[PDB]
Amino acid sequence: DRTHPIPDLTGYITEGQIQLSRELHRKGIYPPIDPLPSLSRLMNNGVGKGKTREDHKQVSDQLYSAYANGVDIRKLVAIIGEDALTENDRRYLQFADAFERFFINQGQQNRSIEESLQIAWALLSMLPQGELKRISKDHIGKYYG
Amino acid sequence: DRTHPIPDLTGYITEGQIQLSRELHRKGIYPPIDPLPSLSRLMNNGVGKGKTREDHKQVSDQLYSAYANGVDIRKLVAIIGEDALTENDRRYLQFADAFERFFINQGQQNRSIEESLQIAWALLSMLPQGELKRISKDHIGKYYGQK
Amino acid sequence: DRTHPIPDLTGYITEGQIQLSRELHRKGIYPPIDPLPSLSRLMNNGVGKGKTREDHKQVSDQLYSAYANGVDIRKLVAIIGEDALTENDRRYLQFADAFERFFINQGQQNRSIEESLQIAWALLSMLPQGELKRISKDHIGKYYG
Amino acid sequence: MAVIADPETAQGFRLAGLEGYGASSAEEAQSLLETLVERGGYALVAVDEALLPDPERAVERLMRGRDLPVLLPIAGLKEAFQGHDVEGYMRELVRKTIGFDIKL
Amino acid sequence: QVSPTRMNLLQRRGQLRLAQKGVDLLKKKRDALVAEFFGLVREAMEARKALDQAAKEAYAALLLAQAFDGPEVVAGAALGVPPLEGVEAEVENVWGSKVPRLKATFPDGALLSPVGTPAYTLEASRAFRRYAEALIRVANTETRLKKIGEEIKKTTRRVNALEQVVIPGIRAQIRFIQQVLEQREREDTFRLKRIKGKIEAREAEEE
Amino acid sequence: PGGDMSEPVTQSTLRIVGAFWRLDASLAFRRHFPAINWNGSYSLFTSALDPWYRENVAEDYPELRDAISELLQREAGLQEIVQLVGPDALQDAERLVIEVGRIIREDFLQQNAYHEVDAYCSMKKAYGIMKMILAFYKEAEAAIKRGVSIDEILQLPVLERIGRARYVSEEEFPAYFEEAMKEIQGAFKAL
Amino acid sequence: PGGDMSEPVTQSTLRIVGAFWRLDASLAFRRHFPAINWNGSYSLFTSALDPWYRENVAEDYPELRDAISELLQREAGLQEIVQLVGPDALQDAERLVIEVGRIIREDFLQQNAYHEVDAYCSMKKAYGIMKMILAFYKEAEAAIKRGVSIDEILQLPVLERIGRARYVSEEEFPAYFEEAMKEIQGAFKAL
């Protein structure tokens, strides 16, 4: 838990933490990080145009938004059954597990930043283009699909 | 929480409580007392004939039960749809929603006790006679049929 | 709750438990011992040939298996309709009801050990022999009347 | 639409401008039922009581989804001298439906 | 989660009140639906009694037309067919479910033999249209009654599942969290006794 | 020290202040910033700042804002029901209340501090965005009693323009506000 | 302080008491005084007071005690599909159970503590009322399967005499009890 005094204080001092989740580990996923309880406060210094790539920060934002919506619609699957989900809801629910088993899961391979970003655009391509509301229009033009 | 020791022991010596609520306050209602969890353990020996007015405890009971089954009908109609209630539940819905903004949403005016009771009977007179099951016959005969 | 210190610290030092149940008490059944949470951690010694009748352990086993299966199916018959259930499940429901009205609810009388065992066989004759898996067929031949 | 009762019954429906079939045995009634289910016919099927009492079976096995060919346990004419015992059918229906048979 | 702060206890009490009020809302939906179901059940039985009435007249007309007039000529007048189709399953919405409501067939505006060359047969062709119309009326009443009845029993099984699980499970977690908070309070009022003992055992008798 | 507001420091600092802005973590776990928990934050400086708002912002500013507050209260009332059944079996009106509360939470309250525009936001601009969402809501419920499906209200080409209202500049804003008020009047009369 | 049994004081009290009597406000709300609840309450002295009853009140006393206690158990059991359906569409031997449960609650349990004669009630009087209700029921349940309807039972003018039976001085009760019992036997012969 993040409420024992040692992680509590350790996150009040440092700048970021990455939390390995027990639930994703039992699915055989390696490195079992989950993104929603993890963060790094110095992302916004060192990513962006001229220093990594101009679309980096917005891709990060949209991945958190979409995966978070997929998880809280899994919590809704957990009562109403899979059938009563409409559409642009099943694409969320498939974005979530396609994310967890193609982006998080990797062996001992070293994927560079172009590989990770083009995999993130490949995963975001599943969503309809009008849904991706935190990405500016030029970046959503020249990478989608 | 009322299980904190401060409201615990205070309500365990004092007699009744009246209780403000954030819900009526966010809808914008002043003063935001909701009268469902409120209670005075000593009203019943303070009101009535000769002290204030004859019908007081019966009016108070009828207001409480009618608003109390107006609230759950409001909560019900968010899934039922307003069509599939009867006429009688619909009248309770209009009772609840005009109650909490004419009787409670006072503003900063001064309502002496008979103005309070005439607003009480004007609010109860959105229900039919004989739906008012608690009030005895003479008060329904005399004060009903206003506004 | 068993996790209170007196149930669990007795449960560590002793050799099993016999647990009365609240729900069997409200049906006028007396002594209200339900048999599912209870066990004797011993009793492999104190049964069997000589010490008891020969068929003792297998009968006790088969009662626990059949009553567990009947109480699972009357958990499920509360959920699904009471007709959408096959042929053997009616005998398991009738066995669980006949069991807890005749075997447990003994009231006042001082049953011998053979009266308990012949009530056990009398309740097991409400079942087809292929439903009696644990009792080896010699005891099935001798008893099962 | 479609019905199955009997050829003598079905020719009246074909005279209505409504597809008829007819089977003497209950298994052949489920055969013709299975036929029009597989050949998905406009969404309605009536079935006589004497052949299939509660003909939900073929559509709940085959077309579990979509609820589309609506089944009806209709009454047959040699039995329509009695009149189906409509009240008993309704008691049987509510007992099948919500489990709890009571008196209206 | 279940990591036991004080704030998780208050969030569980809020969750417990949500479940207890949802139980009463679900019971009230089921009672309003059950009043509606006991409205529809008599209407379904009277549509079927009308179906039995129209049944006896239509089978009587068919028996008379095949008795008097020939079997072969009624086969010949019935093989010549109107287009027979036109039924459709349009949309109805009942408490979170689309159900098929059928409409009529309607080729009855186009009927054969304007000079009806048999006579009793054309009475049967008029009869079985009223028969099929009462048939589709019974169909698109009974399908509504099916869906309302099973929606209701679904609500009851959701009520009993929600009650008998998430009321005792939540009350168990609440008693667990109340226990661990009381225990940490007990450790604190042990350590206070130790601080007071060590402050008095110096500054009351040192030297 | 535990992420709980039941501490000596927190519950001794909420008795001597007004204006208690209470950040949470679920809104921080999704990247939704600033992470203000609406249901447990408050401010006691509203009533005294009524006449200043009526002077220097607009005349009808406080009744407008109390309409925003009661929309968010009705959403937080309905969230009980929608987590207890689903967005299934909500009616036409109540799903609209859900959607308008959601579009307030995404396109009025939500504010990143790294876009160059929309890190400062003057109250002319915030009065504009509230008035756009109240006009949209009001005429959408007028068109929903008049009988449409909500699902094509929720796909109009004006919701993206209200959504992007916060990104446009404080200098070119009143042109954008007049334009989107014209278009929010004109999108519903086409039904 | 919270309706909160398994509080330590109430738990220790219920460990060492001999009888425990709940007082729901809901029965006081439905105007049923004394407001004792016969569901949560219990008594552990019924097994010791058996021969005192058998030698002073009457010889069969605990058996009709247990008959009335299980009849209350049955009414409280099948109130369930009374709540699902209504009291007027049961079976015919179950609407009888709820009707006799209602007459038990309205004449054997409810008691005006201010009325001068309803206040005090000895064992002979309580036994008379008790047997009278039980005799009505045991002939009505035999009657409902042979020769009567339900409306040809609940509309019967001995019911008012059982309802008046508690308003009788104990100095003049057993003379009234004889008339009431013989009138039960006659008026159920008469159908």
CA distances from B129 to B88, B120, B125, B133, F173 (A): 12, 15, 8, 8, 58
Inter-chain CB proximity E38 and G85 less than 8 Å: yes
What stretch of H or E contains E77? helix E71-79
| Residue E84 near residue D17 (C-beta atoms within 8 A) | yes
What stretch of H or E contains E98? strand E98-102
Partners of E93 in the β-ladder: E98
Q: Is B13 on the interface with F (CB under 8 A)?
A: no
- Compute the nearest-CA separation of G1 from chain B (Å): 7
Residues in B 59-78 with any Cβ partner in F closer than 8 A:
75, 78
Using CA atoms, how far apart are residues F53 and F44, in angstroms rounded to an integer? Answer: 15
Are 3 or more Cβ–Cβ pairs between D and B shorter than 8 Å? no
| Residue B75 near residue B4 (C-beta atoms within 8 A) | no
Inter-chain CB proximity D19 and E84 less than 8 Å: yes
- Closest residue of chain E to D73, computed from CA coordinates: E139
- Compute the nearest-CA separation of B85 from chain G (Å): 18
Q: Which one of E2, E3, E159 would you mutate to disrupt binding with A, by most A Cβ within 10 Å of its Cβ? A: E3
Using CA atoms, how far apart are residues B79 and B83, in angstroms rounded to an integer? Answer: 11
Partners of E102 in the β-ladder: E89
| Residue D15 near residue E125 (C-beta atoms within 8 A) | yes
Q: Is E3 on the interface with A (CB under 8 A)?
A: yes
Using CA atoms, how far apart are residues G58 and B107, in angstroms rounded to an integer? Answer: 68
Using CA atoms, how far apart are residues E105 and E85, in angstroms rounded to an integer? Answer: 6
Domain of residue E171 covers: 1-207
Q: Chain D partners of G151 at a C-beta cutoff of 8 Å?
A: none
| Residue A75 near residue A100 (C-beta atoms within 8 A) | no
Q: Chain E partners of F81 at a C-beta cutoff of 8 Å?
A: 25
Total domains, chain E: 1
* Nearest alpha carbon to residue D20 among E81, E126, E118: E81
B78 vs F66, F73, F81: nearest CB: F81
* Nearest alpha carbon to residue C20 among C11, C30, C28: C30
F70 vs B27, B79, B82: nearest CB: B27
| Residue E88 near residue E104 (C-beta atoms within 8 A) | no
* C16-17 vs E89-93, strand pairing mode: unpaired
| Residue A126 near residue A145 (C-beta atoms within 8 A) | no
Using CA atoms, how far apart are residues A135 and A96, in angstroms rounded to an integer? Answer: 19
* Nearest alpha carbon to residue B101 among B13, B35, B27, B45: B27
Using CA atoms, how far apart are residues G182 and C71, in angstroms rounded to an integer? Answer: 50
B72 vs E10, E28, E36: nearest CB: E28
Could you tell me the two tokens for F149? 């499906």
| Residue G75 near residue G63 (C-beta atoms within 8 A) | no
**Assign residue D101 a region: left if phi > 0, alpha if psi is -120 to 50, beta otherwise?**
beta
Q: Is B8 on the interface with G (CB under 8 A)?
A: yes
| CB atoms closer than 10 angstroms to residue C92 | 23
Q: Chain C partners of D61 at a C-beta cutoff of 8 Å?
A: none
- Closest residue of chain A to F111, computed from CA coordinates: A134
Rg (CA), chain C: 17
How many beta-carbon pairs below 8 A join chains C and E?
A: 7
* Nearest alpha carbon to residue G190 among G157, G164, G165: G157
| Residue E44 near residue D73 (C-beta atoms within 8 A) | no
Q: What are the phi and psi torsion angles at E172 (to 5°)?
A: -70, -40
Residue owning tokens 């039976």: G165
> Which of the 8 DSSP states describes residue A104?
I
| Residue D31 near residue D57 (C-beta atoms within 8 A) | no
| Residue G10 near residue G34 (C-beta atoms within 8 A) | no
Using CA atoms, how far apart are residues B8 and E199, in angstroms rounded to an integer? Answer: 34
| Residue D77 near residue D49 (C-beta atoms within 8 A) | no
- Compute the nearest-CA separation of C79 from chain E (Å): 6
| Residues closing a segment before a gap in chain A (C–N exceeding 2.5 Å) | none
| Residue C39 near residue C17 (C-beta atoms within 8 A) | yes
CA dihedral A58, A64, A67, A71 (to 10 degrees): -160
Using CA atoms, how far apart are residues F129 and F137, in angstroms rounded to an integer? Answer: 12
| CB atoms closer than 10 angstroms to residue C102 | 12
Cis (ω within 30 of 0) for the bond into A31? yes
What stretch of H or E contains D21? strand D20-21
Using CA atoms, how far apart are residues F46 and F50, in angstroms rounded to an integer? Answer: 6
Q: Chain G partners of B3 at a C-beta cutoff of 8 Å?
A: 2
Q: Is E184 on the interface with B (CB under 8 A)?
A: no
Architecture, CATH, for domain F44-191? Orthogonal Bundle (1.10)
Partners of E58 in the β-ladder: none
Neighbours of E, requiring at least 3 CB pairs below 8 Å, are: A, B, C, D, F, G
> Which of the 8 DSSP states describes residue D75?
P
CA distances from E113 to D12, E67, E81, F37 (A): 17, 21, 11, 78
Query: What residues contact residue E139 under an 8 Å CB cut-off, 6+ apart?
Result: D44, D70, D72, E102
Using CA atoms, how far apart are residues G105 and G128, in angstroms rounded to an integer? Answer: 16
**Assign residue F3 a region: left if phi > 0, alpha if psi is -120 to 50, beta otherwise?**
left
Q: Chain C partners of D56 at a C-beta cutoff of 8 Å?
A: none
Task: Provide long-range contacts, Cβ within 8 A and 24+ apart, for B144-147.
Answer: B146/B118, B146/B121, B146/B122, B147/B122
Residues in B 53-72 with any Cβ partner in E closer than 8 A:
72
Total domains, chain D: 1
Domain of residue D5 covers: 1-104
Helix-then-strand count for chain B, H and E: 6, 0
Instruction: Quote the strand ranges of chain G, DSSP E.
Output: 19-20, 42-43
B80 vs E10, E21, E32: nearest CB: E32
How many beta-carbon pairs below 8 A join chains A and F?
A: 34
**HSE of D82, CA atoms in CB hemisphere, 13 A:** 12
